[PDB]
C-alpha positions in Angstrom: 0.0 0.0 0.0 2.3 2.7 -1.5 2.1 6.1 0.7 3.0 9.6 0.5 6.0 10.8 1.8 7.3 14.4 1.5 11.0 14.5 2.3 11.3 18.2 3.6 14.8 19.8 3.8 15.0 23.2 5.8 17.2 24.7 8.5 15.8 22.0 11.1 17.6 19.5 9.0 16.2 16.4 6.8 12.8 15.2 7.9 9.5 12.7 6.8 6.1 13.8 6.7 3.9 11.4 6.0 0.9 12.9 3.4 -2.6 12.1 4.9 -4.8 14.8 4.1 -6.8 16.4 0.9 -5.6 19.9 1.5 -1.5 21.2 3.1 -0.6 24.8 3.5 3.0 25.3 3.6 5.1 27.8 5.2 7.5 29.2 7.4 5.0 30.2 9.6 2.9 28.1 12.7 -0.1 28.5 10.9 1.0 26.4 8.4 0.1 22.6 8.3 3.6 21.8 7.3 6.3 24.0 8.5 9.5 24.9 6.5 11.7 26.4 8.7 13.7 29.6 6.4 13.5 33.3 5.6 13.4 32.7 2.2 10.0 30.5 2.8 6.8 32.7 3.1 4.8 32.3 6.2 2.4 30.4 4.2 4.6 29.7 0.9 2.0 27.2 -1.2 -0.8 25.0 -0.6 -0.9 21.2 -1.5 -4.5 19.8 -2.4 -4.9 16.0 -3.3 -7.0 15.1 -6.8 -3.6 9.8 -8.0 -1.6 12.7 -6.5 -1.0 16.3 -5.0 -0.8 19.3 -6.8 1.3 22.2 -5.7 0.4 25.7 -6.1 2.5 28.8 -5.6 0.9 31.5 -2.7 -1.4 31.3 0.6 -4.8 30.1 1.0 -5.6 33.8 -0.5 -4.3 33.2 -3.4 -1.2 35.4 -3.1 2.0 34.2 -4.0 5.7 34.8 -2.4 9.0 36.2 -4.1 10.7 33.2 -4.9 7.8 31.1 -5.8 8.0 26.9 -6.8 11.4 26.4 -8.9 11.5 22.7 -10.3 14.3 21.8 -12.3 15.4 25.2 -12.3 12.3 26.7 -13.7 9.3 29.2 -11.7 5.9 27.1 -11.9 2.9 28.6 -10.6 1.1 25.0 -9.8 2.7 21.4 -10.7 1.1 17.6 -10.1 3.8 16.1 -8.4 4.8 13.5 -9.7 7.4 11.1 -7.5 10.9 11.6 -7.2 10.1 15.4 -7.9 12.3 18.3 -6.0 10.7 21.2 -5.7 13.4 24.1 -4.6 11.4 26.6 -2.5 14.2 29.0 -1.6 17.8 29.4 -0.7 19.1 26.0 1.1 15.1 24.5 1.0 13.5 21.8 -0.4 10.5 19.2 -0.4 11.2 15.6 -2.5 8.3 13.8 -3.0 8.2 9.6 -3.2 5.6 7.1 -3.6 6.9 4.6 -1.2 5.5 1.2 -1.0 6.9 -0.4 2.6 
């Protein structure tokens, strides 16, 4: 029973968050359901909504987006259906890897 796991790479080192839910904000800040810890993250830097995968959009719940936005592969996408094995450089030093693990 392959699961979601977001490897998530910030100033708190390397850590595993197991995906569960239809809908993830993302951010620097407590408010957000999954916390990457940086200055270069937003305090809510995307959102991550479930459809079969999550897709990845750039800016809060409001719909506003940050500076540096979702760079993958070294290119600036506004929303991207992750796919695994997928980087997706948020900033300076940060990072989320996605894999469909199977266990």
């Amino acid at each position: 029973l392959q699961e979601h796991i977001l490897i998530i790479l910030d100033d708190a080192g390397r850590r595993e968050v197991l995906l569960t839910e239809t809908f993830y904000t993302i951010g620097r800040s407590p408010r957000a359901d999954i916390r990457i810890k940086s200055q270069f993250v937003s305090r809510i830097h995307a959102v991550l909504v479930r459809k079969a995968a999550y897709r990845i959009i750039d800016g809060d719940e409001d719909g506003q987006s940050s500076v540096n936005g979702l760079m993958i592969n070294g290119k600036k996408v506004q929303e991207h259906i992750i796919q695994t094995g997928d980087e997706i450089v948020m900033g300076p030093q940060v990072s989320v890897r996605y894999e469909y693990r199977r266990r």
